[PDB]
Write a protein that binds this DNA or RNA. Structure first.
Ligand SMILES: [Mg+2]
Ligand SMILES: [Mg+2]
Ligand SMILES: [Mg+2]
Ligand SMILES: [Mg+2]
Ligand SMILES: [Mg+2]
Ligand SMILES: [Mg+2]
Ligand SMILES: [Mg+2]
Ligand SMILES: [Mg+2]
Ligand SMILES: [Mg+2]
Ligand SMILES: [Mg+2]
Ligand SMILES: [Mg+2]
Ligand SMILES: [Mg+2]
Ligand SMILES: [Mg+2]
Lengths: 121, 153, 206
RNA sequence: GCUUGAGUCUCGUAGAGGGGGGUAGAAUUCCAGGUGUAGCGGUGAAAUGCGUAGAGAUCUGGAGGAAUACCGGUGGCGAAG
RNA sequence: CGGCCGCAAGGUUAAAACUCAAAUGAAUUGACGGGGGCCCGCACAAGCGGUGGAGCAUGUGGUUUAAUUCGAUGCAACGCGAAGAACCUUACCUGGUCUUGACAUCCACAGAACUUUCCAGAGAUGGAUUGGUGCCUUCGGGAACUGUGAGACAGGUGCUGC
RNA sequence: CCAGGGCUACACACGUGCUACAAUGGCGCAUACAAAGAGAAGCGACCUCGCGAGAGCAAGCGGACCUCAUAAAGUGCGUCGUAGUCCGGAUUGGAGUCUGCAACUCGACUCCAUGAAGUCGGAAUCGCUAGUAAUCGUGGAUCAGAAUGCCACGGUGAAUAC
RNA sequence: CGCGGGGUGGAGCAGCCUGGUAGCUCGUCGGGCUCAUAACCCGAAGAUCGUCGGUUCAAAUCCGGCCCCCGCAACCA
RNA sequence: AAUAUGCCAC
């Protein structure tokens, strides 16, 4: 809501951000573009065909390469969504492998920073 | 298979007695292709049982087998919701194979020392209907008797 | 599915070896590298002459290279001034005395390597690939090959989706080992990428 | 004017064509009783349900309602239902 | 909606605004069926022996780290590329260094190469230098091998197997 | 380009294997029977030394000749007598051999010692119908060293299929 | 305000009335079947009982208050 | 006897 109510995935309290590194790995200005799209997720307009609840509560945010494939698996943790993994994929539909990695990161975040987010945040 | 098997593989009768029935017994008892060990164990069991009883080794073996051999077993048929335990009469070759297999299972599961001792004791118990093998035959026949209603098939 | 090499699966049966020198484990690697260098140099320097086949033998500390070519006059030149230079460089590469022997290839229209090279040159020259393939098949079946198959695969005609098209006439029984299937490949480096040409020519039996 | 359309009369024909009235046998159900015991009934299995207060089964006698086995037939009749 | 009919359920007559570029019928080729018929395969059934439990080896995912290089990841990835990571390999990381370059051609100049030895530096690399100063020869120059000097380029296990 | 490090990290999860859980066995002593392959800065006899890995001198052989290289399971005798055990070998301590400039991260092997979990494995799941499965050893490629993997070779050798 | 109750894993409930110890279902986690998910199958963990202070050798239990949540009552003029 | 589902341009 304050244009930055995002939380990036860490494996623990001081666990080196396992998403910021996998995000810096993303080639070139796709990083800035995806930051823009996160801002747009907090804007409330981010266009059609870009977001998809893949399976579970895991939402794929998409960008480019072939057809919207600079993919980012996140999930909504209250008002502030948590960005799990960010990855390049070629074929449509995030590989099952990457999906299952996203699910496991979701569960790990739940068991680290909490199951439901704080009362007021 | 969906075609048909040729004639059964030829089996060389065992040297000490020349009985293909005993050859099959040795083969069934054999583990990891150690026929020498299987034959030694079977021969020791046979001589031991012959000495404890008095019968010839071959005829005593036949008596122990006969007290364990079934006549009707149960096979599974599908109609719906539940399965039919249809009782089917057994052919003699399968009778002997099953008797040998049950004897060997009981002997292996017995708690003695040398397997020759285990086999001699198990066959001796079969000679008066006491072993786990004759217990298994009892179970097979009483299960078939219970399911006898399905026999008509 | 993938298919076995029509030459390799027949080498010991109805084909010859393009190299018949004997050496032991001390010499095998060096002789193979030198044969590779000689063949590469010869093909590069005789791209124009249409060299159909290069056989190499090593009798005794010597190298004999038989060049089955379709323009022996072209590869020889005046008297022998061209083959002399070729022999000199071949000897220098192989580190041993050389002997180049030119072999007449009658009918470049029944030789898989020459057909493939012709088709690739046309493809570079931007001729229609369907026309090139039909021309090759017609030429071979008029020269009298019992059968021929031509396959061209790649970004044909500037397409962005690579496809494969193949023409055929007569019989090309690749499964029969005794059948004379002369097969060979070539590549055409067009401005839109590489295009692969494969030619099978069935010339007869035993 | 005419009769070949249309219609009437004379003789017969086949039909679950319609409306009204009566009756027949088979069967299910119920009621009364007799014999007669622990099961019955049901399902793919099961349970709900019925039964030792005596069911189910079987026999006798009633009551009442509904529908008409066989004939029975891409058979018949009817404008259709 | 309004008339008419109805006791009501509702029937009958009967639009419009908007919205799409189709909806539809019959046949055709496949595919599919918890449709049928006829078959086959260690597919089941009949047997034997395993895995899943234990310790270890190995690969993978995940965490971790500066790096834990990259690839394969339904069957048809996971003792797979890799027929064999101490340095090398090695592509990754931390630092020390070089930029016509380690490797190619071509331009010019210098110098035979080659061998040995001393210093410093983790080594790269830089200082030197003992010996060497030739092989053909239009004997003057070229052939080699080395350094230097600008490049035209070289280099890329960087991306894209859609 | 160079030296160090990493690819060998470990709360975990999965795949594929190896060794086991024992008496159809373990250990000790004697002994029989193979196929196929490799080899020249390579295979390395014999002999001497070492408890062993191995070391010294060193023939022979690019080989139907020599070496690798005594096959093991099997057979004969003894022992153990059902016990977490003379099963089982993980882990760890000390001492060492070889390769390689170099074995700390991170090698293999040997000796002494330690001797773990494991008593046949839930749901589930795999291979196999013949000399196959099962079981026992041998060789090779890669390779300085570094196989339980991979690729081959033989020995013993079944049950079952209505 | 008086009176009767209640506070128990992440949710719903037992247990407590007879002080010697906390269970059920759903859920969660791990594996399995599935191309994948749901259902399903097999294993596991999880609350130290609202809270303070007493009693007692021992308190979820007994007691006294305190906090919050329900229910009844808060009338006659 | 039970046997629900499958949204990522092509
Ligand atoms: Mg693809
Ligand atoms: Mg109306
Ligand atoms: Mg089976
Ligand atoms: Mg496990
Ligand atoms: Mg296991
Ligand atoms: Mg990796
Ligand atoms: Mg390294
Ligand atoms: Mg492809
Ligand atoms: Mg690795
Ligand atoms: Mg031991
Ligand atoms: Mg070797
Ligand atoms: Mg090796
Ligand atoms: Mg074998």
């Amino acid at each position: 809501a304050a244009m930055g109510t995002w939380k990036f995935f860490r494996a623990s309290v001081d666990g080196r951000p396992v998403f910021k590194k996998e995000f810096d790995k993303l080639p070139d200005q796709a990083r800035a573009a995806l930051i823009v799209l996160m801002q747009r997720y907090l804007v409330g307009d981010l266009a059609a065909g870009s977001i998809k609840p893949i399976r579970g509560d895991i939402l794929e945010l998409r960008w480019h390469e072939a057809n919207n494939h600079f993919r980012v698996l996140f999930f909504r943790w209250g008002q502030h969504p948590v960005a799990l993994t960010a990855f390049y994929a070629n074929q449509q539909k995030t590989p099952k492998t990457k999906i299952e990695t996203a699910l496991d990161r979701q569960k790990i975040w739940k068991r680290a920073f909490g199951d439901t987010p704080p009362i007021l945040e | 298979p969906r075609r048909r098997v040729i004639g059964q593989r030829k089996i060389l009768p065992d040297p000490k007695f020349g009985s293909e029935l005993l050859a099959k017994f040795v083969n069934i008892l054999m583990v990891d292709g150690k026929k020498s060990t299987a034959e030694s164990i079977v021969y020791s069991a046979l001589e031991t049982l012959a000495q404890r009883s008095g019968k010839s080794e071959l005829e005593a073996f036949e008596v122990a087998l006969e007290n364990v051999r079934p006549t009707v077993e149960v096979k599974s048929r599908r109609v719906g919701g539940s399965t039919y335990q249809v009782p089917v009469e057994v052919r003699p070759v399968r009778r002997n194979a099953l008797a040998m297999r049950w004897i060997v299972e009981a002997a292996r599961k017995r708690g003695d020392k040398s397997m020759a001792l285990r086999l001699a004791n198990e066959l001796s118990d079969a000679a008066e209907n006491k072993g786990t093998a004759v217990k298994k035959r009892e179970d097979v026949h009483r299960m078939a008797e219970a399911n006898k209603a399905f026999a008509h098939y | 599915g993938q298919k076995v090499h029509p030459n390799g699966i027949r080498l010991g049966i109805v084909k010859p070896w393009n190299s018949t020198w004997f050496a032991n484990t001390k010499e095998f690697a060096d002789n193979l590298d030198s044969d590779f260098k000689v063949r590469q140099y010869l093909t590069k320097e005789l791209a124009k002459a249409s060299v159909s086949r290069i056989v190499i033998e090593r009798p005794a500390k010597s190298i004999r290279v038989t060049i089955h070519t379709a323009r022996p006059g072209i590869v020889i030149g005046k008297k022998g001034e061209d083959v002399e230079k070729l022999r000199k460089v071949v000897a220098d590469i192989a580190g041993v005395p050389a002997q180049i022997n030119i072999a007449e290839v009658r009918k470049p229209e029944l030789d898989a390597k020459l057909v493939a090279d012709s088709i690739t040159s046309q493809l570079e020259r931007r001729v229609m690939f369907r026309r090139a393939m039909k021309r090759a098949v017609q030429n071979a079946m008029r020269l009298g090959a019992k059968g021929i198959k031509v396959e061209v695969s790649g970004r044909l005609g500037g397409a962005e989706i690579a496809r494969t098209e193949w023409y055929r006439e007569g019989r090309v029984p690749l499964h029969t080992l005794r059948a004379d299937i002369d097969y060979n490949t070539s590549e055409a480096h067009t401005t839109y990428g590489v295009i692969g040409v494969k030619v099978w020519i069935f010339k007869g039996e035993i």
